[PDB]
From a paper:
The crystal structure of MsTLP1 was determined using the single wavelength anomalous dispersion (SAD) method. The final R-factor and R-free of the refinement at 2.7 Å resolution are 23.3% and 26.1%, respectively. The polypeptide folds into two distinct domains: an N-terminal thiolase like domain (residues 1–407) and an additional C-terminal domain (residues 435–507), with a 27 residue long linker connecting the two domains. Thus, the N-terminal domain is organized into a five layered α/β/α/β/α structure characteristic of the thiolase superfamily. The C-terminal extra domain (residues 435–507) is made up of 6 β strands and resembles a barrel-like structure with three anti-parallel β-strands on either side of the barrel. Electron density is missing for four segments consisting of residues 17–25, 64–77, 135–170 and 253–254 in the thiolase domain as well as for the N-terminal hexa histidine tag. The six protomers in the asymmetric unit are related by a nearly perfect non-crystallographic 32 symmetry. Therefore, the hexameric state observed in the crystal structure of MsTLP1 is likely to be the result of crystal packing. Static Light Scattering (SLS) and size exclusion chromatography experiments show that, unlike other thiolases, MsTLP1 is a monomer of 56 kDa in solution. The most significant difference is that the active site nucleophilic cysteine, Cys89 of the CXS motif of Z. ramigera thiolase, has been replaced by Gly102 in MsTLP1.
Author numbering: 2 to 17, 26 to 63, 78 to 133, 168 to 252, 255 to 507
């Protein structure tokens, strides 16, 4: 190795009401202890703290652990951020920038798409998920089975994870069967498949030179062997609403950087608030959904607990532990990412190497050069349903549609028409003809 090469040396998790500072503090204290050196000496050596977004929250965490770092960072929103952050400080440790960095996050118990209803995460993921159902040509009930078969192995791992907050294990049948208890929320998801905790996570990272200076046992060092960060264009510009090629590209580029192939990976933690971003990696990569290696280390999002923002740092922590236990093997972490907007991948191993710079910037500019699908904001005429969702938590039930015209440009529409909503809830709408009427609040729709 080169002395500037970055290693993860300490990881920390905590579950418990404590403040969000207090929770990140508890996890940070465990990261400092995990490294096997004197915590206080390590704390004095920290030059940067970075926190994920939930006052100076990163400096309060620092004061609490005995650190006085020159830089404090408050990162941008999104589930990609823990892994984006680890990659960014890896790179800066590799150059002449930083030497000891602490990353942490926590959570407490306490445009033209906006005006159409796309405000929360679930309704928007519904559209992507129904778009993937279109491309695969699966029926509604068939797809619902696929989702339950993907997620049941998740909740099993989740139930044996002590860091999981109040988890019950669920069978495939239990997830797929609509009851008064497991009722339809947003199409196509039943309640048990989408669902508040106290938890903190921290990562301690260093140059190999700082690890020796500070007295950190070598059996604790883990390398970030591969990495990539990718980004999609806004939802209605995407070539296929049912896929995210940027996520797959990130995975493949991170694989290249490590010098390995998909078969060489021993363990996966794939980000899973909804089935889609998991499915999507599987579709573009060849990885089977029932792969014996497993697709989660943590148990995943519905089941593990949490809002979604700081989830992947628990992933990274589990990856790092699992890799110390199986020295020489490789672990992939995937972090999502808005409305499948962002994806960040890290591959971890005890096997040493020099930091390899990734090709994300040039891969991003290639994907940015792809043609964008055209949008008609004020659509007036006859169109085809490309994808849809329904809000079952509203009365009357409310449909959101992305459509196509004859022109081939996309639009959005909202609908409470009793006739149309019956087709979206109880049948198979893809491709059905509808008539859309413009309006500056929402475009409305009805059958043809």
């Amino acid at each position: 190795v080169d002395p500037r090469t970055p290693v993860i040396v300490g990881v920390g998790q905590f579950t418990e009401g404590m403040s969000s500072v207090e929770l990140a503090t508890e996890a940070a204290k465990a990261a400092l202890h995990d490294c096997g050196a004197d915590a206080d000496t390590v704390a004095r050596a920290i030059d940067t703290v970075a926190g994920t977004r939930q006052s100076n929250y990163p400096r309060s965490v620092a004061r609490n652990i005995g650190a006085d770092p020159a830089h404090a960072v408050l990162e941008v929103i999104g589930g990609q951020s823990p892994q984006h952050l680890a990659t960014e400080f890896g790179g800066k440790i590799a150059a002449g920038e930083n030497d000891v960095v602490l990353i942490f996050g926590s959570e407490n118990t306490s445009e033209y798409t906006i005006r159409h209803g796309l405000i929360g995460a679930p309704v928007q993921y519904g559209l992507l998920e129904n778009a993937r159902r279109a491309r695969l040509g699966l029926s509604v009930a068939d797809y619902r089975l696929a989702m339950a078969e993907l997620f049941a192995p998740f909740s099993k791992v989740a139930a044996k994870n002590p860091y999981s907050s109040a988890p019950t294990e669920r069978s495939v049948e239990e997830l797929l069967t609509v009851t008064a208890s497991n009722r339809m929320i947003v199409d196509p998801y039943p309640r048990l498949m989408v669902a508040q905790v106290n938890q903190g996570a921290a990562l301690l990272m260093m140059s190999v030179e700082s690890a020796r200076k500070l007295g950190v046992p070598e059996e604790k060092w883990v390398y970030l062997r591969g990495h990539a960060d990718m980004k999609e264009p806004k939802l209605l510009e995407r070539a296929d609403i049912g896929a995210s090629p940027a996520s797959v590209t990130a995975v493949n580029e991170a694989l290249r950087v490590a010098g390995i192939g998909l078969d060489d990976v021993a363990a996966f933690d794939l980000y899973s608030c909804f089935p889609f971003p998991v499915f999507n990696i599987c579709d573009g990569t060849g990885l089977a959904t029932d792969d014996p290696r497993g697709l989660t280390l943590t148990g995943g999002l519905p089941f593990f607990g949490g809002l979604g923002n700081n989830y992947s740092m628990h992933g990274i922590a589990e990856a790092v532990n699992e890799m110390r236990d199986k020295p020489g093997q490789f672990a992939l972490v995937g972090a999502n990412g808005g409305i499948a907007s962002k994806y960040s991948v890290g591959i971890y191993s005890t096997e040493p190497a020099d930091w390899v710079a990734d090709n994300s910037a040039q891969l991003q500019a290639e994907h940015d050069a792809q043609p964008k699908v055209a949008i008609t904001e004020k659509a007036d005429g006859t169109g085809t349903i490309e994808t849809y969702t329904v809000r079952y938590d509203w009365t009357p039930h409310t449909g959101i549609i992305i459509g196509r015209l004859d022109d081939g440009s996309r639009f959005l529409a909202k609908t409470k028409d009793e006739d149309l909503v019956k087709l979206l809830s109880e049948g198979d709408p893809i491709g059905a003809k509808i008539v859309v009427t413009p309006g500056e609040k929402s475009n409305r729709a009805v059958l043809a």
